[PDB]
Structure formats: C-alpha cells, structure tokens
Amino acid sequence: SGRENLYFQGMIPEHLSIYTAYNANIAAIVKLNQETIQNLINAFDPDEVKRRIEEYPREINEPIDFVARLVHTLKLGKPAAVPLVNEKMNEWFDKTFRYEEERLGGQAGIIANTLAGLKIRKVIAYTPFLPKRLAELFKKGVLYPVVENGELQFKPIQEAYREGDPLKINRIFEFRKGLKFKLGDETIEIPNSGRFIVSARFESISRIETREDIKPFLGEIGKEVDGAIFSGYQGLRTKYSDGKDANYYLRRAKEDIIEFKEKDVKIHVEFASVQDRKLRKKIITNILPFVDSVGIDEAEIAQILSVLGYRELADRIFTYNRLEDSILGGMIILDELNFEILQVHTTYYLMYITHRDNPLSEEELAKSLEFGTTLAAARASLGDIRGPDDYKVGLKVPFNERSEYVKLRFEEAKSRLRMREYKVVVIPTRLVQNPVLTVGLGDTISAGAFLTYLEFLKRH
Amino acid sequence: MIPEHLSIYTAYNANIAAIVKLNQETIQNLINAFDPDEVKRRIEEYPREINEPIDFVARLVHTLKLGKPAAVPLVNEKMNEWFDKTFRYEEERLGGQAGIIANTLAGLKIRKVIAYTPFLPKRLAELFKKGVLYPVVENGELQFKPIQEAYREGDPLKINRIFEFRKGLKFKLGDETIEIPNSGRFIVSARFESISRIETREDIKPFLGEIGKEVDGAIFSGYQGLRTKYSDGKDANYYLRRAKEDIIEFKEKDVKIHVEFASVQDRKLRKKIITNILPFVDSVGIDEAEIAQILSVLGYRELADRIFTYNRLEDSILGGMIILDELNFEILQVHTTYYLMYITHRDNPLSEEELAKSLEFGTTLAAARASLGDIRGPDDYKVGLKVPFNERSEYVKLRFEEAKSRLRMREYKVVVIPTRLVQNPVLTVGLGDTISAGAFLTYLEFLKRH
Ligand SMILES: Nc1ncnc2c1ncn2[C@@H]1O[C@H](COP(=O)(O)O)[C@@H](O)[C@H]1O
Ligand SMILES: Nc1ncnc2c1ncn2[C@@H]1O[C@H](COP(=O)(O)O)[C@@H](O)[C@H]1O
Ligand code: NA
Ligand code: NA
C-alpha cells in the first residue's frame, strides 16, 4: 500500500480481486436497410421462402429458415427471437452481413468489463471458449488464467485467445418502420420498427465448464481472489451428442465451487431465466446451496419457488406481484437452499435477505444495495464504466418516484411477516429516465452489491 | 482380500445403548417411590415425552400392564443422573452409525480409523474398539490419539436405555396386582437439546483439512439428530452450513465422502438434510424405506407410496435412478432384506464386476457380524463367506432382468446382488451400517485400480 489512502476521500472497493466465469459472448447488431433486405431476399426463390414461412421453422438450421422467419417478422412488424442451432451458419451470417457494431455480452464478460472499468486491484475472467474475436472485446485490465510450463500465470485476456475456439455470437437485426422491399412480385412495407434476434444455441458453446488444462489450477486462482462471480449455467443442455448430460457438467461445476470455497473465496451466483424447467431445477439443486450470495430478479423468485414446491406462493407472486410476497418468497428460498445472502433486483426496489447471524448491519446491507443500483444508474447514464469517478454520475440520479410507496409497503410487510429468522433490507432503485444503455443492468447491480458486500465482510 | 491400506474418518453420531433388566424387585422398588394415585393420573394424561421421573414411571407401568413394546423420548438431560442412580445396567455397548462403523473398521484392522463425535464423555469413549483414534489438538498441533483416553469430563451423554420385561412378572400398583401378559422392551431414547448440536466443534474445525490429508475416505452420518429450532436462536440451517463447510474441506483434499442416510420424520427437516448434504458428497447408502422417504419430499409421492407398500425391485430401481438423477452425487448404494444394489453414472470408473464384488463384500461382512455379534479381526470375514446367498437369489435375478426390460436404463450402471442371510443371527443391530462400511471400503480400493 502506498499509504496515501485517505478515509475521508476514498466507496468503491478498490483493493478487491475478483474472478468471473463462465459466460462471455459477442453481441452483434445488423442494420437492415432496403438494399440489405432486398439483396438477402433476392438470393432465394420467393416461392421457396413463402412455403418455408408457412412451415414456420422454430429454429434456424439453414439460411432459408432465417430468411423465412425474418421476412415474416418484417411483414408483420413483430419482434421475434429464433435460436441458431447450427454452428456452421456462423460463416454464412458473417459473409452475408456487415455488423454495425460488435460488443461484449454474457454475464461474466459484462461484469468483468465493469470491474476493470472501476479499476479494482485485479479482475480475472474465465470462459472455456475464447476465440480472438471475443477476447478483443474485453476491456483493458481484464486478465485470463494461463498455464506456462505447469505454472499458473494471469495474462491480458486479449492475448490469451485460441483460434479455432467456438464462437458464440448473438445477432440482433434492427429494422425500421417504413422500409419497403419486394418478395417476388409483392411490395412489403414494414409497419413498425423492431428487432429480430438470432441467439447462438448450438452444441459446442453449451459445454460450460472449466476446461481440463486450467482445472488443476483453480485452487491457485482461489489464493489470488477475494470473490468469484459465477453464471452461465443457463447455457447447459440436458443431453449431449457424446452421451454427456447436464448432470455431468454440474458435477464439474460443484468441483469448481469446492476449490474456491476451501481457499476462503466468497462465491456469488447470478441466476438467470431458465427456459427448461428440468434444467432450472438441476441448477437450483446443484449450485445454489453451495455458494454464498445469489442474485435474482423478481420473475425468478416465482420460478425458483415453483421448483421447490411452493406452488401457491409462486402463483400469487406471478398473479399480483405484491412486495410482501416477494419478501416472503425470498425468505423461503433462503430457508430452503441455505446459502448465505439473497439479493433481489426489481424495477423499483432492491432487496437483501440474510440469516439472522449475518455479520453485516442493516445499514451496511443498505449501502451495498445502494452501491449496486448507483453503479447501474451510472452505467445506464454513460454506456460504459471507464474509471471509478464514473460512479459519481450515478449519485446524481435520484431514487425513483415510488420510493416513499416502496418504504411504506415494506413497513406493512414487516408487520405481517415473521421477521425473526432474517435480516431484510429494501431500498428504492435510482432509475435513469432516458438511459443510453439498458442491457445487462441487473448484472451490474449484482456485481456492485456483491463487491461492496465483500468489502464490508472485511471489517467484521 | 480385506482392503487394508486405507484410512477412514467417520463422524458424527456415537452413543451408548444400555440394557436394564426389569425384574420384579426393580419394578416394585421403582413404583414404590411414587404415590400410586398420582401414577394412575399421569397414565390417564399419557405424556408423549419424558421430562420428569413420573412421566417415565407412568408410561412404563402402562406398557407393562399391556405387555406392549414402546419407545418414548427423554427430553430432559437432567434426568440422565436420575436413570443412572436408579438402575443398574446389564450391558452397555456402543451405538450410533459413526460409532458402529468406527468399531467395524477397527475390527478389520484397516491402516487407520479416526472417529469424531462432538460429545465424548468418558463412558462413551470407553466403548470404542482398540485402534479407533480421535483428533486431539495440543498447543496448536493435531495428533490422532486412542479415543478411549481422549474424552472430556462433563460432555453430554447420549444414552438410549432399553428396559427389558418378561411375561409372568407380577407387581403391585398400590393394591392392584399387575401381571405382565407378554415379554417386550420399553425404550427411552436420548432426545434432549445438547446432543442435537451436530457439528465439528470449533476446537477441531480449523484442522479438518489436516485430517483430510491423512485419510482416503470419510463416512458421515447423524444429520437425523438435528432439530428444527434451538434455544439460543440457532436452527437446523446453522448446523447444515457448518456441515457443508466440513464436506468442502475433505473434498478439496481429494477424500471421497459416503453419507449413511437415516429416517427423518419431519419432512421439512428431511428435505433440508437432502438439499444441503446429498448433492455435495460422493457415495450415499440408504435402505428401501429411505428411497421412498427421499422421493416423497422431492415430489414423487405416488412412486414413494408403491415402494412403502409393495417393496418391488422394479420401483426401488426406478426410485434409485430418480434420486441419483435429481441429486447428482456419484454413487447410490441400497440395502434391502434380499438384495443390495448400486446405481451409478455411465462414466463411473468401476466395472459392473467390481461394483458387484464391492456389494458382495458389504453383505458378506454383515453376515459375519450377524453370525458372530461383532467384527473382531480381519479373519472374521471368512465366517460370512460360509453363509450362502439367500433362497430368493434366482427370483431377484429374474425380477432384475424384467425391471431393466420395462425401465429406461439409459447408460446408468445398475448392479443387483443377493444378500447372504444368516438363519439364526446372534446380532441384528448395525447390519445396514456394516454393509455400507464394507461396500464403501471396497469401492475406494477398486477406485485405486483406475
Ligand atoms: N433506466 C434504468 N436506470 C437504472 N436502473 C435500471 C434501469 N432500467 C433497469 N434498471 C435496473 O436493472 C434491473 C434489471 O433490469 P431489466 O434487465 O430491465 O430486467 C431492474 O430490475 C432495475 O433494477
Ligand atoms: N439375518 C441376516 N443376515 C445377514 N444380513 C442381514 C440379516 N438380516 C438383515 N440383514 C441385512 O441388514 C440390512 C439392515 O436391515 P435391518 O435389519 O432392518 O436394520 C438389511 O437390508 C439386510 O440386507
Ligand atoms: Na460497464
Ligand atoms: Na438485466
């Protein structure tokens, strides 16, 4: 330490080192103007497209599948999301379209970039697939684990790529109201603006794990970091072409958790919407009890309750969305799964639910939540976090108009629910009215609350 | 052969099983201490638990009159002293899963057997077999010392007391002669708060990694002893978080962990134990009723009921595959009267042949224990080898082939062998623990071959 450190002058936990895994991908955008659309359409027989639209492909295996679903979307002006389930089509998309922009996406990747922007002591990101195109989208300051002659090093992630690695690219096709094109001998005028999304959902990128080269060194990484933020389990498949299943990968994920926890690393998992109820339940069973902190949104309280057998409550949260029921559902999830702290983020309020013996005071818990929503507000206002001073931009965003109402409903809920086994803290969010960016804000909230949580634990 | 070259840690439950012989004089002197009208009144009230000497006398006299076997919990630790002053014990022996397993492994003279229980009064320590060790910390340094001398004076004493009574015995309740109509046992189980705080206590906790370095496997049991709530604000969850920390410390040291599961009546607590422990360990040993109890709180109510009711091998296989699919530990062992089973993942290193030999070692070892009353030395194993496989072996085998025909076997490895059932066993306590000990020991040995 330099010793120029001043208590009065310096809320961002600068001294922390954090590991993030497993999910990072490319988010690419294509602007569909008139020439782009017509040239795409022209490549195909119009009758063949029309027949395919009638067949209505629910996933993309061939170029015609994509063209039929996109044209259908454009004619109705209705946004849609269609999975790409064929890795070989990456080359087709890339030869066919020019990308307006390419950004990092995925929870681990977006959280890594935010923390490097905050200039904390060390940020190390891990993804099993790191082609050069992805590695280059990480911010300066992000590290990646490398084995250099049976010894563990951390290298700049931009230099650590493997060519040949599968490329997870999610593509957003933007269209505008009013554009016209011809399908054979029929003029189509797009009735409104929207987006058509093609998500990467082929096999190679669903093998989510620490690969066998880095695995023996996870303990040595654990010695370097104060915290680990894990996500990406939602990308797993229930069955694989080589006879593996989601369970196979979850046993490897539990091995990873054991290596970090034994080294006294606190682990946060950022939960996600999980489509497949069967996979959702496996992630909840295999992962959540064995970690420290879990970050969810409001919709996810009901989805987790449901798989744990609390069907009445899940229905009620879904039907009415009462704050009292969200606090009860958080309490039950914490009681059932018995990790250390739950954080829930919603449009108008953030919440922590902890065990009665958590070391932090309710004031510390509030400040950690405040730091999460303030960091999101900054990121929403600026687009990207570039230095620790950017946090102050977030401080200028007021707590939202519903703040009084949230606090009143919170006091009412306390009077109605059994509080004794828990600490519960609810704070209003700082909502940016006209944000420059909205993707990934929940991950930003979770990263910021978890980082400050770690720092507060160091004073107990 | 006997695997010899293995070191095993076992925790957390050990207790005393003590027997009292209720002869006419013991019964009459006991009763004589009390107002017979007050005894009758307490019997009318019918206490479900023992908090005071009159609760015990009341329930006991009521079972003696009916000749009815019964079990009533002791919920008052302060009454240990009363029992011990009032009665002479015909016999005291070690019980509890981790105690019985420790004594079995020490009898096999494996390389090292370390037991841990957080409550070790001198009376308990003395009932461990020669060779059982206990972790002891002196000036910040860990040693493994004979458990018999590692006791702490004043530790809580978990003693289960079995009162044996005989048909024909007569006694007087006031002026009424009571003659006992059937022989039987009245059991008083230790169910007070201090012995439900199941954990590694803070003096040894920091050293679990250093134990991990010394052992090849760990067998954990006794989670069924936890309570939902404690008088100092703790709850089952507090002890379950500590239990997960212990598991992490051994797994990082590459120790395989077996959990010997048990009946838990409270379904909500049962589910907490399953949630917090079973997905985190390697091997899990259960019997037929436990398959149904687990299935029940996972939401397979209809399957669980078929198992409780009918005991069909086909439903036990299906139930077993469901449990391994849901919980995703490494290997499931199921012990039942007529057969033992393993269910694993398709990528388990062991061959079906080694899986079957591991199960055969489990049942053989139980057969030896059942024949002899104990495992005294490694050669006792040979006594089990002379107990034939049971008469239902052919039937089990047919039912097994029929089950695989009807069930989606995926590529799970499922191995079913018949038990060696002893005709007139001298002992029937701890047999399931003994199977699980032998099957797990051999599993670890076979894992070394890959
Ligand atoms: N405009 C905004 N300003 C600040 N925070 C926001 C904004 N929009 C969303 N968030 C936060 O991000 C969380 C997740 O957002 P979403 O990805 O829309 O579900 C929400 O629950 C809010 O807590
Ligand atoms: N007479 C016997 N000889 C050998 N093994 C036995 C005998 N009786 C029961 N077992 C085994 O011991 C296990 C424990 O069952 P229990 O006797 O109900 O506690 C059973 O599943 C059988 O596999
Ligand atoms: Na950022
Ligand atoms: Na979000």
PDB file of N, CA and C in Angstrom, chain B residues 318-362:
ATOM      1  N   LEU B 318     -36.215 -47.787 -10.148  1.00  0.00           N
ATOM      2  CA  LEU B 318     -36.699 -46.519 -10.672  1.00  0.00           C
ATOM      3  C   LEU B 318     -36.474 -45.385  -9.661  1.00  0.00           C
ATOM      4  N   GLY B 319     -36.825 -45.652  -8.403  1.00  0.00           N
ATOM      5  CA  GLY B 319     -36.644 -44.684  -7.309  1.00  0.00           C
ATOM      6  C   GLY B 319     -35.184 -44.310  -7.134  1.00  0.00           C
ATOM      7  N   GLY B 320     -34.328 -45.319  -7.165  1.00  0.00           N
ATOM      8  CA  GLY B 320     -32.874 -45.092  -7.107  1.00  0.00           C
ATOM      9  C   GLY B 320     -32.343 -44.228  -8.259  1.00  0.00           C
ATOM     10  N   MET B 321     -32.727 -44.555  -9.505  1.00  0.00           N
ATOM     11  CA  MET B 321     -32.285 -43.726 -10.652  1.00  0.00           C
ATOM     12  C   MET B 321     -32.801 -42.282 -10.556  1.00  0.00           C
ATOM     13  N   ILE B 322     -34.074 -42.122 -10.172  1.00  0.00           N
ATOM     14  CA  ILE B 322     -34.606 -40.766  -9.918  1.00  0.00           C
ATOM     15  C   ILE B 322     -33.780 -39.997  -8.870  1.00  0.00           C
ATOM     16  N   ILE B 323     -33.393 -40.636  -7.761  1.00  0.00           N
ATOM     17  CA  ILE B 323     -32.676 -39.949  -6.683  1.00  0.00           C
ATOM     18  C   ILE B 323     -31.292 -39.516  -7.238  1.00  0.00           C
ATOM     19  N   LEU B 324     -30.636 -40.427  -7.955  1.00  0.00           N
ATOM     20  CA  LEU B 324     -29.276 -40.088  -8.473  1.00  0.00           C
ATOM     21  C   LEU B 324     -29.373 -39.018  -9.561  1.00  0.00           C
ATOM     22  N   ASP B 325     -30.411 -39.101 -10.387  1.00  0.00           N
ATOM     23  CA  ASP B 325     -30.651 -38.087 -11.405  1.00  0.00           C
ATOM     24  C   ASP B 325     -30.880 -36.694 -10.756  1.00  0.00           C
ATOM     25  N   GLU B 326     -31.711 -36.637  -9.717  1.00  0.00           N
ATOM     26  CA  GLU B 326     -32.078 -35.363  -9.104  1.00  0.00           C
ATOM     27  C   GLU B 326     -30.929 -34.756  -8.318  1.00  0.00           C
ATOM     28  N   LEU B 327     -30.277 -35.596  -7.517  1.00  0.00           N
ATOM     29  CA  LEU B 327     -29.323 -35.103  -6.512  1.00  0.00           C
ATOM     30  C   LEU B 327     -27.893 -35.066  -7.061  1.00  0.00           C
ATOM     31  N   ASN B 328     -27.612 -35.966  -7.987  1.00  0.00           N
ATOM     32  CA  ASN B 328     -26.337 -35.910  -8.744  1.00  0.00           C
ATOM     33  C   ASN B 328     -25.052 -36.003  -7.892  1.00  0.00           C
ATOM     34  N   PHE B 329     -25.028 -36.895  -6.889  1.00  0.00           N
ATOM     35  CA  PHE B 329     -23.807 -37.311  -6.224  1.00  0.00           C
ATOM     36  C   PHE B 329     -23.227 -38.423  -7.162  1.00  0.00           C
ATOM     37  N   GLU B 330     -22.313 -39.264  -6.708  1.00  0.00           N
ATOM     38  CA  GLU B 330     -21.550 -40.114  -7.638  1.00  0.00           C
ATOM     39  C   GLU B 330     -22.150 -41.529  -7.685  1.00  0.00           C
ATOM     40  N   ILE B 331     -22.542 -42.016  -6.544  1.00  0.00           N
ATOM     41  CA  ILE B 331     -22.952 -43.448  -6.491  1.00  0.00           C
ATOM     42  C   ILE B 331     -23.947 -43.712  -5.382  1.00  0.00           C
ATOM     43  N   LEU B 332     -24.997 -44.488  -5.706  1.00  0.00           N
ATOM     44  CA  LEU B 332     -26.016 -44.805  -4.699  1.00  0.00           C
ATOM     45  C   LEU B 332     -25.944 -46.265  -4.332  1.00  0.00           C
ATOM     46  N   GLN B 333     -25.886 -46.575  -3.030  1.00  0.00           N
ATOM     47  CA  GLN B 333     -25.989 -47.971  -2.598  1.00  0.00           C
ATOM     48  C   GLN B 333     -27.284 -48.173  -1.819  1.00  0.00           C
ATOM     49  N   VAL B 334     -28.011 -49.235  -2.148  1.00  0.00           N
ATOM     50  CA  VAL B 334     -29.284 -49.508  -1.476  1.00  0.00           C
ATOM     51  C   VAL B 334     -29.203 -50.890  -0.879  1.00  0.00           C
ATOM     52  N   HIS B 335     -29.498 -50.994   0.421  1.00  0.00           N
ATOM     53  CA  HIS B 335     -29.531 -52.296   1.062  1.00  0.00           C
ATOM     54  C   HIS B 335     -30.978 -52.669   1.441  1.00  0.00           C
ATOM     55  N   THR B 336     -31.363 -53.908   1.124  1.00  0.00           N
ATOM     56  CA  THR B 336     -32.684 -54.409   1.472  1.00  0.00           C
ATOM     57  C   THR B 336     -32.517 -55.845   1.978  1.00  0.00           C
ATOM     58  N   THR B 337     -33.585 -56.383   2.526  1.00  0.00           N
ATOM     59  CA  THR B 337     -33.526 -57.770   3.017  1.00  0.00           C
ATOM     60  C   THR B 337     -32.854 -58.734   2.074  1.00  0.00           C
ATOM     61  N   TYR B 338     -33.366 -58.853   0.843  1.00  0.00           N
ATOM     62  CA  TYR B 338     -32.968 -59.955  -0.073  1.00  0.00           C
ATOM     63  C   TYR B 338     -31.945 -59.555  -1.109  1.00  0.00           C
ATOM     64  N   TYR B 339     -31.705 -58.254  -1.280  1.00  0.00           N
ATOM     65  CA  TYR B 339     -30.705 -57.863  -2.258  1.00  0.00           C
ATOM     66  C   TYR B 339     -30.055 -56.494  -1.891  1.00  0.00           C
ATOM     67  N   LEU B 340     -28.862 -56.282  -2.432  1.00  0.00           N
ATOM     68  CA  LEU B 340     -28.171 -54.944  -2.378  1.00  0.00           C
ATOM     69  C   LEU B 340     -28.075 -54.426  -3.801  1.00  0.00           C
ATOM     70  N   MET B 341     -28.019 -53.110  -3.966  1.00  0.00           N
ATOM     71  CA  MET B 341     -27.938 -52.573  -5.295  1.00  0.00           C
ATOM     72  C   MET B 341     -26.977 -51.378  -5.281  1.00  0.00           C
ATOM     73  N   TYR B 342     -26.282 -51.198  -6.398  1.00  0.00           N
ATOM     74  CA  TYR B 342     -25.596 -49.926  -6.709  1.00  0.00           C
ATOM     75  C   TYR B 342     -26.223 -49.346  -7.978  1.00  0.00           C
ATOM     76  N   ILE B 343     -26.348 -48.024  -7.984  1.00  0.00           N
ATOM     77  CA  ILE B 343     -26.675 -47.276  -9.172  1.00  0.00           C
ATOM     78  C   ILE B 343     -25.632 -46.161  -9.282  1.00  0.00           C
ATOM     79  N   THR B 344     -25.030 -46.076 -10.460  1.00  0.00           N
ATOM     80  CA  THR B 344     -24.016 -45.066 -10.730  1.00  0.00           C
ATOM     81  C   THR B 344     -24.316 -44.365 -12.045  1.00  0.00           C
ATOM     82  N   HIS B 345     -23.416 -43.424 -12.373  1.00  0.00           N
ATOM     83  CA  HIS B 345     -23.377 -42.801 -13.702  1.00  0.00           C
ATOM     84  C   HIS B 345     -22.649 -43.667 -14.684  1.00  0.00           C
ATOM     85  N   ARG B 346     -22.990 -43.500 -15.960  1.00  0.00           N
ATOM     86  CA  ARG B 346     -22.359 -44.228 -17.042  1.00  0.00           C
ATOM     87  C   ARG B 346     -20.848 -44.093 -17.025  1.00  0.00           C
ATOM     88  N   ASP B 347     -20.308 -42.988 -16.509  1.00  0.00           N
ATOM     89  CA  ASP B 347     -18.856 -42.853 -16.531  1.00  0.00           C
ATOM     90  C   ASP B 347     -18.121 -43.205 -15.227  1.00  0.00           C
ATOM     91  N   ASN B 348     -18.809 -43.892 -14.319  1.00  0.00           N
ATOM     92  CA  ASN B 348     -18.132 -44.365 -13.135  1.00  0.00           C
ATOM     93  C   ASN B 348     -16.906 -45.219 -13.536  1.00  0.00           C
ATOM     94  N   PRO B 349     -15.760 -45.080 -12.840  1.00  0.00           N
ATOM     95  CA  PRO B 349     -14.598 -45.876 -13.294  1.00  0.00           C
ATOM     96  C   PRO B 349     -14.798 -47.395 -13.109  1.00  0.00           C
ATOM     97  N   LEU B 350     -15.537 -47.808 -12.085  1.00  0.00           N
ATOM     98  CA  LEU B 350     -15.646 -49.253 -11.793  1.00  0.00           C
ATOM     99  C   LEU B 350     -16.388 -50.052 -12.847  1.00  0.00           C
ATOM    100  N   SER B 351     -15.957 -51.295 -13.075  1.00  0.00           N
ATOM    101  CA  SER B 351     -16.695 -52.215 -13.926  1.00  0.00           C
ATOM    102  C   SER B 351     -17.912 -52.747 -13.168  1.00  0.00           C
ATOM    103  N   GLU B 352     -18.925 -53.230 -13.871  1.00  0.00           N
ATOM    104  CA  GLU B 352     -20.024 -53.929 -13.187  1.00  0.00           C
ATOM    105  C   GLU B 352     -19.515 -55.059 -12.297  1.00  0.00           C
ATOM    106  N   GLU B 353     -18.439 -55.704 -12.738  1.00  0.00           N
ATOM    107  CA  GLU B 353     -17.814 -56.753 -11.943  1.00  0.00           C
ATOM    108  C   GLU B 353     -17.261 -56.272 -10.592  1.00  0.00           C
ATOM    109  N   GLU B 354     -16.536 -55.157 -10.593  1.00  0.00           N
ATOM    110  CA  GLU B 354     -16.036 -54.575  -9.350  1.00  0.00           C
ATOM    111  C   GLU B 354     -17.180 -54.047  -8.495  1.00  0.00           C
ATOM    112  N   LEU B 355     -18.184 -53.436  -9.114  1.00  0.00           N
ATOM    113  CA  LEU B 355     -19.367 -52.962  -8.355  1.00  0.00           C
ATOM    114  C   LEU B 355     -20.023 -54.147  -7.592  1.00  0.00           C
ATOM    115  N   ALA B 356     -20.207 -55.249  -8.307  1.00  0.00           N
ATOM    116  CA  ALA B 356     -20.777 -56.459  -7.702  1.00  0.00           C
ATOM    117  C   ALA B 356     -19.872 -57.011  -6.585  1.00  0.00           C
ATOM    118  N   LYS B 357     -18.556 -57.039  -6.761  1.00  0.00           N
ATOM    119  CA  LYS B 357     -17.649 -57.510  -5.684  1.00  0.00           C
ATOM    120  C   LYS B 357     -17.640 -56.585  -4.453  1.00  0.00           C
ATOM    121  N   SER B 358     -17.930 -55.320  -4.656  1.00  0.00           N
ATOM    122  CA  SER B 358     -17.976 -54.382  -3.536  1.00  0.00           C
ATOM    123  C   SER B 358     -19.232 -54.630  -2.691  1.00  0.00           C
ATOM    124  N   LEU B 359     -20.360 -54.719  -3.359  1.00  0.00           N
ATOM    125  CA  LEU B 359     -21.592 -55.166  -2.717  1.00  0.00           C
ATOM    126  C   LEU B 359     -21.426 -56.522  -2.055  1.00  0.00           C
ATOM    127  N   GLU B 360     -20.756 -57.482  -2.693  1.00  0.00           N
ATOM    128  CA  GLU B 360     -20.627 -58.841  -2.065  1.00  0.00           C
ATOM    129  C   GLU B 360     -19.843 -58.720  -0.753  1.00  0.00           C
ATOM    130  N   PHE B 361     -18.808 -57.868  -0.740  1.00  0.00           N
ATOM    131  CA  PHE B 361     -18.037 -57.630   0.496  1.00  0.00           C
ATOM    132  C   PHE B 361     -18.914 -57.034   1.602  1.00  0.00           C
ATOM    133  N   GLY B 362     -19.797 -56.101   1.240  1.00  0.00           N
ATOM    134  CA  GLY B 362     -20.743 -55.487   2.185  1.00  0.00           C
ATOM    135  C   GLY B 362     -21.617 -56.552   2.846  1.00  0.00           C
TER     136      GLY B 362
END
